[PDB]
Amino acid sequence: MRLGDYKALSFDCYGTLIDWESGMIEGLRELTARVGTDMSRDEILQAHARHESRQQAQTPGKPYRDLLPIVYKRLAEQWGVPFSQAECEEYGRSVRNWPAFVDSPGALQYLKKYYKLIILSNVDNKTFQYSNEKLQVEFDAIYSAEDVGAYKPSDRNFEYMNGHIGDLGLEPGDILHTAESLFHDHVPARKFGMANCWIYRRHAQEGFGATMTPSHEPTYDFRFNSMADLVKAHQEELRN
């Protein structure tokens, strides 16, 4: 079972390629400073993970940039601090400042030479263009929640992808699904019988941070601590 057996990689974006935990800590800085209970970084992230995933189930058709303002509000009310609608909307715009993991541009440019690259992402298209600039590669396809009408882990996001990869000359068996999130990505990837590769970004950290906890932890076919280590394994297959 080898990485070179696939023609294409489908990627999660935020958590896998974009460091959305740094980005949202920064976008929420002014809000959490009002709490003054000196909350840990991971307590903020997990509180966000709960409200974001519940709100993505509540309104599956809401553009991500309009859904994050509601999550900001839900956080503020949970913490008992005051806030404004203008601050909510600004936090929804902050995604364009969420930084890439620094190995992402290099790793994607390497993989571009061997793989068609697909994005399957919980995002709107306007917002994702700003992240695509940071990642500095051209994706063969971008299947966003806005395109789908729903957010991962919904069946609909994976059905949508399977319904369009034909236009790239691909079948589901050609695709290695590569992601950080057990809950958003690997539980549904396994359910659809995809080969999957877990990028364990939080390997040196405690808990799941900004990704919701999965009900039952899924299996995976590959695991690497980073995109750099994925590229290292692939170079290894080529020389062996």
Identify whether 38 is a catalytic site residue. no
Structural tokens at position 135? 């990642």
The kind and range of the H/E element at 227 are helix 227-239
Q: Distance (Å, rounded) from C-alpha 68 to C-alpha 38?
A: 23
Burial class (CB in 10 A: 0-12, 13-18, 19+), 70: middle
Please check whether residue 114 is in contact with residue 136, taking contact to mean a CB–CB distance below 8 angstroms: no
The kind and range of the H/E element at 68 are helix 64-79
206: left (phi over 0), alpha (psi -120 to 50) or beta: beta
Q: Distance (Å, rounded) from C-alpha 47 to C-alpha 51?
A: 6
Of the residues 12, 19, 147, 174, only one is catalytic, namely: 12
- Report phi then psi at 97, rounded to 5: -95, 0
User: Which residues carry out catalysis?
Assistant: 12
